[PDB]
Design a protein around this ligand. Structure first.
Ligand code: HEM
Ligand code: HEM
Ligand code: HEM
Ligand code: HEM
Ligand code: HEM
Ligand SMILES: O=S([O-])[O-]
Ligand SMILES: [Ca+2]
Ligand SMILES: [Y+2]
Ligand SMILES: [Y+2]
Ligand SMILES: [Y+2]
Length: 471
């Protein structure tokens, strides 16, 4: 039994746990060290074309430390510039995987209420970043999943629920609360006051299983689209960081190595074992993360991982080049008068191409967690894109444009022009929001005692559109 067996007052604030667990608190805070903003649209402008019509064509950066999760959720151009709790582009579900205030609010408002309304609804309540309470019971300190959709997905896929799982399984499932592919299911409900409401509920598309193809079948069966492509008008699916799903296809996952084994390695100090809570790049800490199971040098292992990254990059660039061209060629065919009927098969190929390729690349560790599945997925996605392009030549020819050359999209700026993203306008609007409503949110949360200003140190120095140069 713990020193906090009746629970922790202010449990959503990780600082409240520090008195009991100073070591884990200290290492947990060190994800502040991982402050790099890598603008993935700048690095891979083909993604802008892939995501035309979708917020990821505005702003999409690589992950950084958990310390920044909440602030990055606020800063991303994807969440736009609300003026109040009823405005802004995105729904309340966007907080879900960013904050320990999420289970706090779910446990208080209920899941459906939590999932009802705009992201801006909770701006002055959801103010702590990924914290102890996202993964731990505040009485027993045991690992817990705090979000109902995970068990729902696990059960749908025929897996054991969190509670039914082994400890070693839980050491990955706590991560899978967030590091999974999801969609928002529009969910009609009626509250305690009999008011009809609409929730957008985080849902794991796992009822046919957790392979990319099973999820593709799932989404096709329900005719789901995350958006209609801004160039090709294809019904598109967006993959989001299927880190756990793909990790399950990989040899380490198959062998029962948990996320925590690599990302939260143990340090043994006499009779006491401590987990490193600085969740980051295991390659920064290889003696602890890798070398308990692997012999021979760190450099050789690093070199092998680099080769995996390079193979993935090679296939990713091919697949997304063909995907981008297919979108653009479809847009051209549309401009010339090609009908939806004439483009239907093409669009299905593009949807599947991009679903598979996005699923391969959307988990930034998948190239390592499941290298062979990632390569197969990129190859499969590229094949679908090329089938679309072969069919597109014929449609273009029918409309007198067989010699059409899809425009180049080799810089973010050129790609964003093709995707009709006025990023300057979005940035200007965003800055106004940050300078006004965001600061009101933080001021109110501090006044109410939901937010400790200590947690804000260095948290808002960088985004894809500013860098105060300090983080
Ligand atoms: C032990 C389980 C977990 C592992 C192994 C893990 C792994 C990671 C890693 C390696 C990163 C990038 C870190 C860096 O660049 O330095 C990251 C970022 C992120 N993780 Fe986790 N994670 C876990 C649990 C969670 C949970 C439970 C959530 C949701 C509550 C979550 C949400 C996120 C988010 C939102 C980011 C991006 C933060 C940002 O860019 O601001 N993770 N995670
Ligand atoms: C559409 C609503 C959401 C928004 C606006 C949002 C925003 C963000 C942002 C800004 C990042 C940092 C990287 C980037 O710039 O893209 C991020 C990363 C991440 N988000 Fe979300 N998020 C949303 C929904 C979710 C949900 C529901 C989950 C969990 C089920 C989740 C889990 C994660 C994870 C695990 C990462 C780090 C891994 C990665 O970026 O590949 N996010 N999110
Ligand atoms: C500052 C906030 C946190 C505190 C005070 C805390 C506390 C603890 C404690 C006391 C332990 C057991 C001793 C140890 O292995 O070090 C532990 C382990 C662990 N925690 Fe945390 N934790 C925090 C944040 C998190 C978060 C956010 C996650 C999930 C993303 C997480 C996931 C885990 C995992 C996977 C283990 C290993 C469990 C095991 O191997 O038995 N912790 N943590
Ligand atoms: C489902 C469980 C796991 C989750 C949620 C997870 C999460 C992540 C994430 C989000 C990244 C990308 C980090 C970034 O882009 O900044 C990553 C990369 C990586 N992970 Fe994992 N991981 C898991 C399992 C594992 C395991 C079991 C190992 C060791 C065998 C491992 C080792 C690595 C390595 C070597 C990288 C590449 C370096 C990096 O980008 O940080 N991961 N992981
Ligand atoms: C980030 C640290 C690690 C790195 C860089 C790493 C690297 C690798 C590589 C390159 C492979 C070949 C499989 C493939 O083609 O992807 C592999 C396999 C394997 N690794 Fe790791 N690994 C790490 C962590 C771990 C840990 C923590 C464990 C044990 C808890 C482990 C146990 C295994 C096992 C059992 C295999 C299957 C081959 C065999 O049976 O020996 N690895 N690892
Ligand atoms: O936007 S979140 O799912 O990466
Ligand atoms: Ca999705
Ligand atoms: Y306290
Ligand atoms: Y990173
Ligand atoms: Y392999």
């Amino acid at each position: 039994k713990t020193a906090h067996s009746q629970g922790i007052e202010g449990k959503a604030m990780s600082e409240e746990w520090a008195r009991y667990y100073p070591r884990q608190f200290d290492s947990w805070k060190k994800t502040k060290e991982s402050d790099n903003i890598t603008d993935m649209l700048k690095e891979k402008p083909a993604l802008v074309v892939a995501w035309a019509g979708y917020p990821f064509s505005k702003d999409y950066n690589a992950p950084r430390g958990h310390y920044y999760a909440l602030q990055d959720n606020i800063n991303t151009l994807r969440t736009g510039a609300p003026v109040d709790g009823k405005t802004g582009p995105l729904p309340s579900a966007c907080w879900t995987c960013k904050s320990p205030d999420v289970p706090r609010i779910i446990e208080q408002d209920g899941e459906l209420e939590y999932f009802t309304g705009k992201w801006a609804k909770y701006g002055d309540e959801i103010v702590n970043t990924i914290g102890c309470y996202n993964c731990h019971d505040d009485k027993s300190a045991e690992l817990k999943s705090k979000v109902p959709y995970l068990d729902r997905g696990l059960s749908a896929a025929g897996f054991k629920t969190f509670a039914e799982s082994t400890h070693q399984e839980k050491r990955s499932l706590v991560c899978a609360q967030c590091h999974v592919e999801f969609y928002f299911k529009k969910t009609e409900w009626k509250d305690d006051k009999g008011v009809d409401k609409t929730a957008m509920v985080v849902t794991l598309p796992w009822s046919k299983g957790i392979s990319t193809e099973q999820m593709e079948a799932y989404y096709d069966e329900i005719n789901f689209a995350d958006w209609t492509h801004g160039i090709s008008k294809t019904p598109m699916l967006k993959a989001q960081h299927p880190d756990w799903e793909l990790y399950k296809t990989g040899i380490h996952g198959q062998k029962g190595v948990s996320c925590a084994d690599c990302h939260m390695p143990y340090t043994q100090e006499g009779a006491v074992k401590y987990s490193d809570h600085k969740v980051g790049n295991p390659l920064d800490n290889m003696d602890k993360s890798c070398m308990n199971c692997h012999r021979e040098s760190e450099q050789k292992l690093k070199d092998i991982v680099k080769q995996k990254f390079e193979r993935k990059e090679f296939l990713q660039d091919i697949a997304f080049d063909n995907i981008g061209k297919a979108h653009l060629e479809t847009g051209k065919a549309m401009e010339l008068g090609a009908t939806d009927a004439e483009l239907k098969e093409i669009r299905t190929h593009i949807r599947h191409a991009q679903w598979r390729a996005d699923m391969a690349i959307a988990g930034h560790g998948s190239f390592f967690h499941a290298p062979e599945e990632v390569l197969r997925l990129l190859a499969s996605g590229n094949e679908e894109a090329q089938k679309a392009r072969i069919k597109l030549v014929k449609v273009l020819a029918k409309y007198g444009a067989i010699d059409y050359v899809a425009p180049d999209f080799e810089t973010k700026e050129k790609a964003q022009k093709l995707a009709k993203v006025d990023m300057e306008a979005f940035i200007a609007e965003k800055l106004k929001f940050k300078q006004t409503l965001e600061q009101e949110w933080k001021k109110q949360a501090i006044a109410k005692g939901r937010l400790n200003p200590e947690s804000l140190k260095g948290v808002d120095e960088k985004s894809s559109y500013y860098d105060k140069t300090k983080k």
